[PDB]
C-alpha cells in the first residue's frame, strides 16, 4: 500500500507569492508502460475535490497557467507562481499506478498575516440553566494568530479537567485570524461546591499566560 507522505500539512503564504508542495511515495510510481500516474486535486471548503493536474505535469481543462508539475517515481512537487484568492484549500495527490489507490495527507494553504493575541472572555452560568440543573462555564478566545494556543480550566487552583468542549473557526475572510470557544460543563451540584473558575491561554503573543476567572457559588 503505497503511502503517500506530503509536506507541509499547513503553508501560510501571502497572496501574490509563489508556493510549492512536496508529495512522496514508498514505491516508484513508474509503470511498465513508463508513466508516473501521480495527480493533484484541490478541495475547497464545502466542495468536492476537483482534479488540477495529472501524469505529473498535465494541467486539466481550464486550470490556470500558474501550476507546474514535476517528479519521477518517488519524489514530486506542485509549484504555483502567483498564489491567488481562489487557491486556498487542501491539495491532495494520489497514485493510480498500483491498486489500491492512495491519497496523500493534504496540504491546507492559508494566508500568512501578523501575530495577534486572543481577546479572552469568561462567562458564568446562566441563572436560568441552574434551574435545569446543569452548569456550563463558556470562554471565548477570539481573533488571534497563529492558530497555536492551549486553554486550561482551573477550579480552585486545581486543573482536574476532562468535561471540556472546544470548537474553532477557520481563517476569517477579513482579518485572517482564528477564534476558539472552550466550555467546561459541570452539574449544579458539582458547581455549587466550589469557588473560583479560571480560564487560561498559552499563545506566542505573551510570555505570561493570559488568565481570566471569577469567584462564587457554594454551600
Amino acid at each position: 500500500d503505497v503511502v503517500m507522505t506530503q509536506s507541509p500539512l499547513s503553508l501560510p503564504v501571502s497572496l501574490g507569492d509563489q508556493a510549492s508542495i512536496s508529495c512522496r511515495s514508498s514505491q516508484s510510481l513508474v509503470h511498465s508502460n513508463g508513466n508516473n500516474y501521480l495527480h493533484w486535486y484541490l478541495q475547497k471548503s464545502g466542495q468536492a475535490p476537483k482534479l488540477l493536474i495529472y501524469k505529473v505535469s498535465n494541467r486539466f481543462s481550464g486550470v490556470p497557467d500558474r501550476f507546474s508539475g514535476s517528479g519521477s517515481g518517488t519524489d514530486f512537487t506542485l509549484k504555483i507562481s502567483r498564489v491567488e484568492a481562489e487557491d486556498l484549500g487542501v491539495y491532495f495527490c494520489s497514485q493510480s499506478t498500483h491498486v489500491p489507490l492512495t491519497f496523500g495527507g493534504g496540504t491546507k494553504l492559508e494566508i500568512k498575516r501578523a501575530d495577534a493575541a486572543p481577546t479572552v472572555s469568561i462567562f458564568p452560568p446562566s441563572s436560568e440553566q441552574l434551574t435545569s440543573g446543569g452548569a456550563s462555564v463558556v470562554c471565548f478566545l477570539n481573533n488571534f494568530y497563529p492558530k497555536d494556543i492551549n486553554v486550561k480550566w482551573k477550579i480552585d487552583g486545581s486543573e482536574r479537567q476532562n468535561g471540556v468542549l472546544n470548537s474553532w473557526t477557520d481563517q476569517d475572510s477579513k482579518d485572517s485570524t482564528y477564534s476558539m470557544s472552550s466550555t467546561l460543563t459541570l452539574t449544579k451540584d458539582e458547581y455549587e461546591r466550589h469557588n473560583s473558575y479560571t480560564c487560561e491561554a498559552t499563545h506566542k503573543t505573551s510570555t505570561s499566560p493570559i488568565v481570566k476567572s471569577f469567584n462564587r457559588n457554594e454551600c
Binding site: 495527480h39 501524469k55 486539466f60 489500491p100 491519497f103 477570539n142 468542549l165 472546544n166 470557544s181 481570566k212
Partner: protein, 216 residues
C-alpha cells in the same frame, strides 16, 4: 458537460443498511468506471473500490469488503454502493468518481453525500444567554454570547438582532457531546451601547424553535 448526480443525504440508526447512487450523463456510460471515496472527519480521503471497466468489483479495498457492495444499472445510468452494519464510525461523506485512463484518473466527481449515524431522537435545544464576562468586565468593548446546547439533528440558525448585527459576531462549528450537539456565538460591540437591552439572540431549530434577550 459530463455530470454525476449522486443523491443523498441520509440520517440512519446503527446496524442498518443504506444504498447510495451516482447517475452519469454527458458521456458514454459503459466506456468508463465508478470509484467511491470516503471523506472522514479525520479528513484524509480513502478509496473503497471500483466497479465496471477494469475491475475489482462487489467492493474491494482491504478495509471495505463485505462492508460495502457495488452494483450498476446501465438502463438508467446509475451506480449503487451499499453500506450495511452501520455504525457512527461510518459517518462520512461518500464521493463517486469517474475513473479515467491515460487522460489520467479522477476527472469528474459527485457532490458528495453525508450520512449521519445516530441513536439520538429529535431533540430541541436549550438555549441560554451569556452576559457580560465577569460582570465587572465591561470597559471599552463588551462581548456577550449564547449557548445553544443539546439539540438533534443539524442545523440550527442563530442570528443577533434579526440579522442586523453582523460585524464582530463569531458563531462556532456545532460540536457533538453525547449523542446531541451544542453551538455558541459571541458578539462584541462598543461598551457605551449595551446594557441598553438592545441585544437579542435568535435561534431556530427546524423541528420547531425560537429566541432569547440579554438582560440588564
Amino acid at each position: 458537460q459530463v455530470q454525476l448526480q449522486q443523491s443523498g443525504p441520509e440520517l440512519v440508526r446503527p446496524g442498518v443498511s443504506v444504498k447510495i447512487s451516482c447517475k452519469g450523463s454527458g458521456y458514454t456510460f459503459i466506456d468508463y468506471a465508478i470509484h467511491w471515496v470516503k471523506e472522514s472527519h479525520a479528513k484524509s480521503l480513502e478509496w473503497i473500490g471500483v466497479i465496471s471497466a477494469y475491475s475489482g468489483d462487489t467492493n474491494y479495498n482491504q478495509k471495505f469488503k463485505g462492508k460495502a457492495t457495488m452494483t450498476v444499472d446501465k438502463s438508467s445510468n446509475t451506480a449503487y454502493l451499499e453500506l450495511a452494519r452501520l455504525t457512527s464510525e461510518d459517518s462520512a461523506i461518500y464521493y463517486c468518481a469517474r475513473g479515467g485512463w491515460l487522460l489520467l484518473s479522477f476527472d469528474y466527481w459527485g457532490q458528495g453525500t453525508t450520512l449521519t449515524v445516530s441513536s439520538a431522537k429529535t431533540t430541541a435545544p436549550s438555549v441560554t444567554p451569556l452576559a457580560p464576562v465577569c460582570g465587572d468586565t465591561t470597559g471599552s468593548s463588551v462581548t456577550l454570547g449564547v449557548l445553544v446546547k443539546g439539540y438533534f439533528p443539524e442545523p440550527v440558525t442563530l442570528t443577533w438582532n434579526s440579522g442586523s448585527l453582523s460585524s464582530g459576531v463569531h458563531t462556532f462549528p456545532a460540536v457533538l457531546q453525547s449523542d446531541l450537539y451544542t453551538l455558541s456565538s459571541s458578539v462584541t460591540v462598543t461598551s457605551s451601547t449595551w446594557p441598553s437591552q438592545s441585544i437579542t439572540c435568535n435561534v431556530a431549530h427546524p423541528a420547531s424553535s425560537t429566541k432569547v434577550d440579554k438582560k440588564i
